[PDB]
Design a protein around this nucleic acid. Sequence first.
RNA 1: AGCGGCGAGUACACUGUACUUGCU
RNA 2: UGCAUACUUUUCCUCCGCCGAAAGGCGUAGGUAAUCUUUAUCAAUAUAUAUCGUGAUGGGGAUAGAUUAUUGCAAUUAUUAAUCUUGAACGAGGAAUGCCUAGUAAGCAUGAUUCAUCAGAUUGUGCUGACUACGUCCCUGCCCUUUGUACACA
Lengths: 154, 41, 98, 180, 138, 48, 59, 128, 96
Amino acid sequence: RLLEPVPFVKTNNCIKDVDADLFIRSYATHLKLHNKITYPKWCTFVKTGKGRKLAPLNEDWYFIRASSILRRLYLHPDIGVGFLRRQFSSKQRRGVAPNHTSLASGKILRSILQQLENLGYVEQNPKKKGRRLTTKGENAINNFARYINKKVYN
Amino acid sequence: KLNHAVFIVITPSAIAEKYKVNLSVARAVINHLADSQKLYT
Amino acid sequence: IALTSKNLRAIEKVCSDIMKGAKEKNLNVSGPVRLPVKTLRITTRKSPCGEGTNTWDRFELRIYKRLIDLYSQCEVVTQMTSINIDPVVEVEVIITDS
Amino acid sequence: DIKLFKKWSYEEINIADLSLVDCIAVSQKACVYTPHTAGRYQKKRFRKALCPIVERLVNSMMMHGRNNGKKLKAIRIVAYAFEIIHLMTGENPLQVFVNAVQKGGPREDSTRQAVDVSPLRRVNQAIYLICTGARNAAFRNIKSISECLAEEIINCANESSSSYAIKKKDEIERVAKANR
Amino acid sequence: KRVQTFGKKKTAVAVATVTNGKGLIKLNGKNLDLVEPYILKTKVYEPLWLIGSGKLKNLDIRIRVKGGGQTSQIYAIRQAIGKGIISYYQKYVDESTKKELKDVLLRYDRSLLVGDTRRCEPKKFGGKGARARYQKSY
Amino acid sequence: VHPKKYGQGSRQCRVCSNKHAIIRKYNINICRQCFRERADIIGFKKYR
Amino acid sequence: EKSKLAKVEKVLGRTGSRGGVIQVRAQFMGRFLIRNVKGPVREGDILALLETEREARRL
Amino acid sequence: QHILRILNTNVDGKEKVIIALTAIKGIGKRMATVICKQANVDPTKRAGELTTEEIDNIVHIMSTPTQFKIPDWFLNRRKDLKEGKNIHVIANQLDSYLREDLERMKKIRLHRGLRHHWGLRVRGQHTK
Amino acid sequence: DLDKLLDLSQDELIKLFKARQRRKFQRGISKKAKSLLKKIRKSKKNCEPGEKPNPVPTHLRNMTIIPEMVGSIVATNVEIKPEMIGYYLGEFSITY
RNA sequence: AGCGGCGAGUACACUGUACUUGCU
RNA sequence: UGCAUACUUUUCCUCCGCCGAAAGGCGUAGGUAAUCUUUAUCAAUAUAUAUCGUGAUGGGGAUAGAUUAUUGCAAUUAUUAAUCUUGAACGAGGAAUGCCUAGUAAGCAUGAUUCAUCAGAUUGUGCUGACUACGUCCCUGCCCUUUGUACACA
């Protein structure tokens, strides 16, 4: 069902040629299996964003978000915290006042970025101030994406 | 006022109408039998 | 060398001057840069008193700016522009090397 | 060659009422893989009929209170309803919809005295009764909308009493016959 | 060698370029299958069956999208790729097939080659609605 | 006096010297009442 | 019940209380027949008749 | 199985366990959510098989969660300025502390106190 | 009970207080409130402890209260208490 | 601001591709 | 601490990296601007999958209590605000009444205005693109002709 006949030649040379939706879940599962990062304990008592006003209700949201930020890191190689907050921003019902868009909480994204830097998948540099992937992480994610592509292909 | 329970075509609406169950328990029974909406198998 | 004004005919004549002067002086010049027009607007209400139907009107000021570059003496270029310029237009200067 | 959802080129079509076929104008020009044809639709009078009947259907299940503008969900709901019609009844649901439109629309009404109903107006008004019936069926009655359209379309295709469209057509025709 | 065409449908804008290759048609950095709506995947597939995968097997068509809503860029890319294939047939591959290609395109739909002029009109005075003013009480 | 560098007390309309209906767009700093008639000579030409 | 064919050879006029009725000549086989039709009708439309010799009123 | 009666009504058998412990109290779905997290009950299950051991765990959790990681800000009624500190205080007895808080503001008898006393809102319903 | 509040310094005072009075006191108290403070201290030290001290002249509605400001009333007779401290005073024409 | 061209690649194809650096 | 005196600009949007769930805070990139916010992209309606499966329910947020921070010399008539607790009506609405013919209805947002702080207000912009006429004078409101007037402040 999730696979469709494609009438043009693909490339599959990196993550940009694979669907995001399955990539996030597959790499969250891989992260859970490998125990690459902590949960951590502190983050699971707070809602993801002010406008959400409710718990994520999945218990794997941290790992589901980490791979999404990795995807965004590759999609354009300059990542800050404002861009992440705006992307994961959500509508907020102010009660009797009209619905208004508000950003997500940035501390969880800051913690995710720090953990990714600790893992070494991402590096910081003065030039290209936004977060970008290292060459090691780039080729590793290329091979991982090709593995996922072949796994869902045959 | 709901009355259905879980204690005793595979589309959830048809299964719910057949077994007098809610949609969630009907979906659970569908998973049990096979092993939001998507294309029919 | 960039120009800014409010009336398009002024910038048109000013530009028509500089291309012909450049061709006369046979010096390397970039082509006429046609910048996107930047428009300034404000909306206000008529009827200074509070009575009557609320009626509002808007205004529009598009500002014309164009660029050009020349390899020529900063003195001769400013002399020719001052000779063939009008106070309405405001012009700034920058030179190139290659 | 061209198939609906890569499945139906509808090589066979009934004679119907000799006018509703031209009104629906399902043809190679109107053949489309999926609904949501955003072409011009208010250019002339015959242009209203030039729209495919499938597009007419998918373009009108949207209206109920707060769900205006939501068109892709309407497309998916009619796609699921079409699949449900196929699974419940083995015949082609496209022919099912054609029978529904050819035997659902009221033919004679009354205004002041009774009058006839144009082929085009009959097709749209039949679509409209399908719309109101489906909206009532989805109006807080547990069952999903796709099942609602499946039931109503099959009922009006078979002229069943459980069809709100057929019921209202019969009511209108009864009033018209009483008046004239 | 290299031909370039443009695309404007609704608010969205697109750029197409047809070059020799092996059938590499890419939208930005992704593939056309990764759009998400299969409903619009059908729309992009519509021109392809009207021309030919075999004839596309030797041409690479790059596509960029910048702005507009989902329906806007799907229609923009549809008409842009139509223009690209028409121009590159007129230039490089062959001209005898080009007349039949354009004949098929027009006899199927005129929206493929050229888009609509419909766009949002300036919001009027009076009230929230463009063609409606505020409710008044006597 | 108790002057403040903020609010309506900080600045007023230049021509009518009133504290009401003063616009701050593009630092016009003038009241709409007289701005309506000074608009044309200022350059604010109405198109729509 | 039953409906019968009708050939719109020409349009006659838009009448009625609100201008919502159209005079149109019908055809099943009685050639010359008068009918009142609601809804947009173009040149060359086929209509449905309920009665054989029931005639409208021409204004 | 179903229909379990405790200090507050918990006739919630078929409805979810999480919604059950929200409905008993903490209807803001955060006290109940964190209590379920602390007591380690999977939301996948229902309320029809809640055990008395887990109920005792729930009471152990809500009995002064200060020692738990539940922070002071997430603690309901954070300061309530006095010589001590208070906590989120569940349901029927919890009503008693807002009763006595109302008594304190009545004896305070300030502008908002008489506004609440005479039958007006704090910000005013604005019948102008 | 209130002796600790009487003796503790401004830092512990604001810490015990809510954020509103912390912000107010950190931003400033102003010479008007300082003069009112010294005048009320003199009036309290001169007044007999057996009687309630008089209110303040030149009334205004925008000074906080400190448990060191005790015994004060307003020229509207609610005697200030520690549980009324973080409110200012108000007490203007609201007559029904 | 864009279309490119090539100067070096990060991984795959095979008789260019997603991402990086500079000029015309 | 306060007064007087000299030194840069702090007196806009802000990106970032950090402290704080957040509110908010510290130090810096950039920009008087198609150059930095930001624009190879800033919102939402969606979208795909999960839970709920129509039970005033978990919908719904009127209501009050506890606070943390900023704005403002000053917020008490708790400006605004993140968090928690609190839990009203509401089963789609009498008589009447308003609006509307294609990127328009409607929904969804969002820019700007006054703004030190406060849009539920007003004025632009875009996305989601509809059902129906393609006419009529029945009401209403005007217009023309004829007509009758003892009206002309009609």
